[PDB]
Design a protein around this motif. Structure first.
Motif, PDB file in Angstrom:
ATOM      1  N   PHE A 257       0.868  -1.207   0.000  1.00 47.25           N
ATOM      2  CA  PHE A 257       0.000   0.000   0.000  1.00 47.25           C
ATOM      3  C   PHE A 257       0.895   1.245   0.000  1.00 47.25           C
ATOM      4  CE2 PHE A 257      -2.601   3.171   2.442  1.00 47.25           C
ATOM      5  CZ  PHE A 257      -3.453   3.483   1.406  1.00 47.25           C
ATOM      6  N   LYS A 258       1.074   1.867  -1.169  1.00 49.96           N
ATOM      7  CA  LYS A 258       1.974   3.039  -1.362  1.00 49.96           C
ATOM      8  C   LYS A 258       1.235   4.317  -0.948  1.00 49.96           C
ATOM      9  CE  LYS A 258       3.706   0.553  -5.439  1.00 49.96           C
ATOM     10  NZ  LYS A 258       3.571   0.471  -6.913  1.00 49.96           N
ATOM     11  N   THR A 259       1.678   4.966   0.130  1.00 51.27           N
ATOM     12  CA  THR A 259       0.994   6.133   0.742  1.00 51.27           C
ATOM     13  C   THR A 259       2.018   7.074   1.381  1.00 51.27           C
ATOM     14  OG1 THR A 259      -0.748   6.824   2.255  1.00 51.27           O
ATOM     15  CG2 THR A 259       0.504   4.858   2.890  1.00 51.27           C
ATOM     16  N   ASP A 260       1.622   8.324   1.608  1.00 53.37           N
ATOM     17  CA  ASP A 260       2.442   9.337   2.319  1.00 53.37           C
ATOM     18  C   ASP A 260       2.171   9.238   3.827  1.00 53.37           C
ATOM     19  OD1 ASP A 260      -0.177  10.379   2.037  1.00 53.37           O
ATOM     20  OD2 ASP A 260       0.541  12.450   1.864  1.00 53.37           O
ATOM     21  N   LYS A 261       1.222   8.381   4.223  1.00 54.12           N
ATOM     22  CA  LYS A 261       0.756   8.215   5.627  1.00 54.12           C
ATOM     23  C   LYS A 261       0.307   9.569   6.182  1.00 54.12           C
ATOM     24  CE  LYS A 261       4.264   4.594   6.157  1.00 54.12           C
ATOM     25  NZ  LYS A 261       5.567   4.280   6.779  1.00 54.12           N
ATOM     26  N   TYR A 262      -0.316  10.405   5.343  1.00 57.42           N
ATOM     27  CA  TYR A 262      -1.065  11.607   5.784  1.00 57.42           C
ATOM     28  C   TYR A 262      -2.408  11.123   6.343  1.00 57.42           C
ATOM     29  CZ  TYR A 262      -3.695  16.000   5.469  1.00 57.42           C
ATOM     30  OH  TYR A 262      -4.503  17.068   5.721  1.00 57.42           O
ATOM     31  N   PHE A 263      -2.572  11.161   7.669  1.00 52.55           N
ATOM     32  CA  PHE A 263      -3.804  10.689   8.348  1.00 52.55           C
ATOM     33  C   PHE A 263      -4.830  11.824   8.371  1.00 52.55           C
ATOM     34  CE2 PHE A 263      -6.450   9.409  12.051  1.00 52.55           C
ATOM     35  CZ  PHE A 263      -6.858   8.183  11.577  1.00 52.55           C
ATOM     36  N   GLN A 264      -6.091  11.498   8.083  1.00 52.72           N
ATOM     37  CA  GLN A 264      -7.227  12.434   8.274  1.00 52.72           C
ATOM     38  C   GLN A 264      -8.331  11.720   9.047  1.00 52.72           C
ATOM     39  OE1 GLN A 264      -6.977  13.399   3.764  1.00 52.72           O
ATOM     40  NE2 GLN A 264      -8.229  15.013   4.702  1.00 52.72           N
ATOM     41  N   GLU A 265      -8.950  12.427   9.980  1.00 55.36           N
ATOM     42  CA  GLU A 265     -10.196  11.957  10.626  1.00 55.36           C
ATOM     43  C   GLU A 265     -11.298  12.055   9.575  1.00 55.36           C
ATOM     44  OE1 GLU A 265      -9.765  14.434  14.547  1.00 55.36           O
ATOM     45  OE2 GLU A 265     -10.548  12.409  15.059  1.00 55.36           O
ATOM     46  N   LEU A 266     -12.121  11.015   9.473  1.00 55.96           N
ATOM     47  CA  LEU A 266     -13.306  10.964   8.579  1.00 55.96           C
ATOM     48  C   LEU A 266     -14.385  11.937   9.066  1.00 55.96           C
ATOM     49  CD1 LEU A 266     -14.644   9.690   6.220  1.00 55.96           C
ATOM     50  CD2 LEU A 266     -15.439   7.822   7.689  1.00 55.96           C
ATOM     51  N   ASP A 267     -14.755  11.810  10.345  1.00 56.75           N
ATOM     52  CA  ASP A 267     -15.889  12.514  11.002  1.00 56.75           C
ATOM     53  C   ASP A 267     -15.337  13.231  12.237  1.00 56.75           C
ATOM     54  OD1 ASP A 267     -18.367  12.714  12.901  1.00 56.75           O
ATOM     55  OD2 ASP A 267     -19.313  11.974  11.047  1.00 56.75           O
ATOM     56  N   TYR A 268     -15.664  14.517  12.382  1.00 55.39           N
ATOM     57  CA  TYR A 268     -15.091  15.451  13.381  1.00 55.39           C
ATOM     58  C   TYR A 268     -15.970  15.486  14.639  1.00 55.39           C
ATOM     59  CZ  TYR A 268     -12.018  17.169   9.573  1.00 55.39           C
ATOM     60  OH  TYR A 268     -11.097  17.280   8.560  1.00 55.39           O
ATOM     61  N   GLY A 269     -17.049  14.702  14.679  1.00 62.58           N
ATOM     62  CA  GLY A 269     -18.023  14.720  15.785  1.00 62.58           C
ATOM     63  C   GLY A 269     -17.548  13.991  17.034  1.00 62.58           C
ATOM     64  N   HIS A 270     -18.407  13.968  18.054  1.00 63.00           N
ATOM     65  CA  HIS A 270     -18.132  13.390  19.397  1.00 63.00           C
ATOM     66  C   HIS A 270     -18.279  11.858  19.386  1.00 63.00           C
ATOM     67  CE1 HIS A 270     -19.108  17.608  20.067  1.00 63.00           C
ATOM     68  NE2 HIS A 270     -18.426  17.518  21.220  1.00 63.00           N
ATOM     69  N   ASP A 271     -19.105  11.308  18.496  1.00 61.47           N
ATOM     70  CA  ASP A 271     -19.630   9.926  18.652  1.00 61.47           C
ATOM     71  C   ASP A 271     -19.592   9.196  17.313  1.00 61.47           C
ATOM     72  OD1 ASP A 271     -20.541   9.964  21.579  1.00 61.47           O
ATOM     73  OD2 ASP A 271     -21.555  11.743  20.743  1.00 61.47           O
ATOM     74  N   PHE A 272     -18.398   9.025  16.751  1.00 58.75           N
ATOM     75  CA  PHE A 272     -18.162   8.320  15.466  1.00 58.75           C
ATOM     76  C   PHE A 272     -16.947   7.397  15.626  1.00 58.75           C
ATOM     77  CE2 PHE A 272     -19.133   8.194  10.913  1.00 58.75           C
ATOM     78  CZ  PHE A 272     -17.992   7.613  10.411  1.00 58.75           C
ATOM     79  N   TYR A 273     -17.158   6.092  15.436  1.00 55.91           N
ATOM     80  CA  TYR A 273     -16.115   5.042  15.556  1.00 55.91           C
ATOM     81  C   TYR A 273     -16.583   3.783  14.826  1.00 55.91           C
ATOM     82  CZ  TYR A 273     -12.286   2.263  17.492  1.00 55.91           C
ATOM     83  OH  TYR A 273     -11.144   1.534  17.617  1.00 55.91           O
ATOM     84  N   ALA A 274     -15.675   3.131  14.099  1.00 60.63           N
ATOM     85  CA  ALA A 274     -15.866   1.781  13.515  1.00 60.63           C
ATOM     86  C   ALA A 274     -16.882   1.874  12.374  1.00 60.63           C
ATOM     87  CB  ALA A 274     -16.312   0.805  14.577  1.00 60.63           C
ATOM     88  N   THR A 275     -16.410   1.706  11.142  1.00 57.72           N
ATOM     89  CA  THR A 275     -17.197   1.935   9.909  1.00 57.72           C
ATOM     90  C   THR A 275     -17.337   0.623   9.139  1.00 57.72           C
ATOM     91  OG1 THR A 275     -15.223   2.587   8.716  1.00 57.72           O
ATOM     92  CG2 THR A 275     -16.513   4.372   9.712  1.00 57.72           C
ATOM     93  N   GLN A 276     -18.338   0.593   8.266  1.00 55.96           N
ATOM     94  CA  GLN A 276     -18.494  -0.393   7.173  1.00 55.96           C
ATOM     95  C   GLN A 276     -18.716   0.392   5.882  1.00 55.96           C
ATOM     96  OE1 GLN A 276     -18.948  -4.059   6.843  1.00 55.96           O
ATOM     97  NE2 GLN A 276     -17.621  -3.968   8.639  1.00 55.96           N
ATOM     98  N   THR A 277     -18.233  -0.129   4.758  1.00 54.63           N
ATOM     99  CA  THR A 277     -18.520   0.414   3.408  1.00 54.63           C
ATOM    100  C   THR A 277     -18.992  -0.716   2.494  1.00 54.63           C
ATOM    101  OG1 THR A 277     -16.291   0.219   2.477  1.00 54.63           O
ATOM    102  CG2 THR A 277     -16.779   2.234   3.721  1.00 54.63           C
ATOM    103  N   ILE A 278     -19.780  -0.349   1.492  1.00 55.28           N
ATOM    104  CA  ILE A 278     -20.165  -1.235   0.363  1.00 55.28           C
ATOM    105  C   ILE A 278     -20.179  -0.361  -0.891  1.00 55.28           C
ATOM    106  CG2 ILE A 278     -22.671  -0.943   0.573  1.00 55.28           C
ATOM    107  CD1 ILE A 278     -22.983  -3.922   0.036  1.00 55.28           C
TER     108      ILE A 278
END
Ligand SMILES: OC[C@H]1O[C@@](CO)(O[C@H]2O[C@H](CO)[C@@H](O)[C@H](O)[C@H]2O)[C@@H](O)[C@@H]1O
Length: 464
Positions: A257-278
């Motif tokens: 996985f070729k990346t710059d390892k620039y981390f971003q938070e997805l959601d800036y809220g108080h109560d967001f953890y553990a995601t699923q995608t389809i």
């Protein structure tokens, strides 16, 4: 399946249901019928319906011996409860994924079992199968995958997908107190070949990498996951644990996985953890657990805990994953509550649900005061042009970020009985926070300017 164990749980739920205080229960977010929900699991499309599971403890509004809860939808808006998909045995049914093989919906989930050695637990990957999309039977020869580099006890939350002639899985692990994610693949779902340590914390990215995910978006590989052990850094990483992403490129030849390892938070809220995608309809849908570890859950005493977020559509605009509510979320709209000018100190009244589209001038402060009709705890949503930040003050607890609008300067705000989701602009800045107050939502314009506000009540799309 154990018919006794199942029937006893189905009847515990059907009976415990009457003791559930409805005051904070969501109208249009997925909630457990009773008891505790955490991480969403096995987001899948099977026999004309989206299927979603979740980390479920039926017997109390706190975490416990892990089951898989189960819901399904045509439109990703309305959800029906189905019977508990997985009941624990020797293993706790920890997080994982789901994929359609033949006539079958296949769950690949982590089985956690107790041991009598320092970790006092071990993690492996279990299979379960269904042809009816209701009843699930665990594979006799579980676990199908046990090998983990450095024999780490942490080996959980498989996210499985099909590419060419192989199923691939990313799985969360640790090693020397460093979070990492492992890539494996199988020709048959039963025999798993280790490929690579896809990424690892160098020290600053935490001790455990939970609920990994990997998918293509805007012509790039997204590595999306839930690291534990990040230090708060200015405005960022203030929640107990984080959900965020790297952007790069998965090479299916080198399994790098070729990346710059620039981390971003997805959601800036108080109560967001553990995601699923389809992925379907050429779109990328995402859902998260709408709570946070090791912080008060004000709904706990009402005999339940946790909801999911709204399903969001993802796009990659430059370096930013935007989240937006589903194109057809407008189907939730009942009463038109307001249109046009909302003067300073003017208020709009809802039931337990609200959709608000607002615009002001970004040269001046924007501020909504959100509170129950009978008073109680307050949440404020603020644009402060002095610092160029959106600020969600949830009962005194601040989440804020600098906001550089992509295009639209309007906000779209969704209130449910005990939740707030703010979508700024084209979804570059999103806050998901659980909110609690006394009664029906009143939203007041605290801005020193008149706002343009389009506001609706929203119907139920999920069970009580
Ligand atoms: O239900 C287990 C399930 O949840 C996740 C993600 O939240 O991990 C949790 O497991 C433990 C429960 O006490 C905690 O140590 C951990 O911090 C918590 O996040 C998944 O990794 C797991 O499959």
């Amino acid at each position: 399946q154990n018919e006794t164990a199942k029937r006893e749980l189905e009847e515990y739920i059907a009976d415990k249901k009457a003791e559930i205080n409805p005051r904070y229960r969501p109208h249009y977010h997925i909630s457990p019928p009773v008891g505790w929900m955490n991480a969403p699991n096995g987001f899948s499309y099977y026999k004309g319906k989206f299927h979603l599971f979740y980390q479920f403890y039926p017997y109390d509004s706190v975490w416990g011996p892990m089951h898989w809860g189960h819901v399904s939808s045509s439109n990703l808006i309305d959800w029906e409860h189905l019977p508990t998909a997985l009941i624990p045995e020797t293993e706790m049914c920890f997080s994982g994924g789901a994929v359609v093989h033949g006539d079958d919906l296949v769950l690949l989930y982590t089985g956690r079992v107790t041991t009598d050695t320092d970790p006092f637990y071990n993690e492996t990957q279990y299979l379960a199968f269904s042809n009816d999309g209701v009843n699930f039977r665990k594979y006799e020869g579980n676990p199908v995958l046990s090998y983990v580099p450095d024999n780490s006890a942490d080996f959980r939350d498989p996210k499985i997908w099909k590419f060419k002639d192989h199923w691939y899985v990313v799985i969360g692990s640790s090693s020397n107190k460093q979070g990492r994610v492992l890539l494996y693949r199988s020709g048959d779902l039963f025999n798993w070949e280790f490929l690579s340590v896809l990424g690892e914390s160098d020290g600053d990215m935490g001790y455990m990498w939970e609920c990994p995910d990997l998918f293509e978006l805007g012509g790039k590989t997204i590595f999306l996951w839930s690291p534990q052990g990040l230090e708060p850094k200015g405005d960022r990483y203030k929640n107990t644990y984080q959900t965020g992403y790297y952007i790069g490129e998965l090479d299916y030849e080198t399994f790098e996985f070729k990346t710059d390892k620039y981390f971003q938070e997805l959601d800036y809220g108080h109560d967001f953890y553990a995601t699923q995608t389809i992925q379907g309809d050429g779109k990328t849908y995402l859902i998260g657990w709408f709570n946070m570890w090791e912080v008060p859950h004000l709904e706990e005493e009402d005999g339940w805990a946790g909801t999911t977020t709204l399903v969001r559509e993802l796009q990659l605009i430059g370096t930013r994953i935007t989240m937006n509510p589903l194109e057809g979320i407008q189907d939730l709209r009942t009463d038109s509550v307001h249109n046009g000018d909302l003067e300073p100190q003017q208020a709009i009244e809802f039931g337990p649900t609200a959709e608000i589209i607002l615009q002001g001038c970004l040269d001046q402060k924007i501020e909504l005061l959100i509170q129950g009709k009978e008073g109680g705890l307050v949440t404020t949503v603020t644009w402060d042009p002095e610092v160029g930040k959106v600020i969600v003050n949830r009962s005194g607890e601040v989440r804020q970020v600098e906001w550089v609008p992509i295009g639209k300067t309007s906000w779209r705000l969704f209130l449910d009985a005990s939740s707030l989701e703010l979508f700024c602009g084209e979804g570059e800045v999103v806050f998901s926070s659980r909110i609690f107050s006394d009664g029906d939502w009143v939203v007041k314009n605290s801005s020193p300017q008149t706002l343009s506000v389009e506001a609706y009540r929203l119907r139920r799309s999920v069970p009580a």
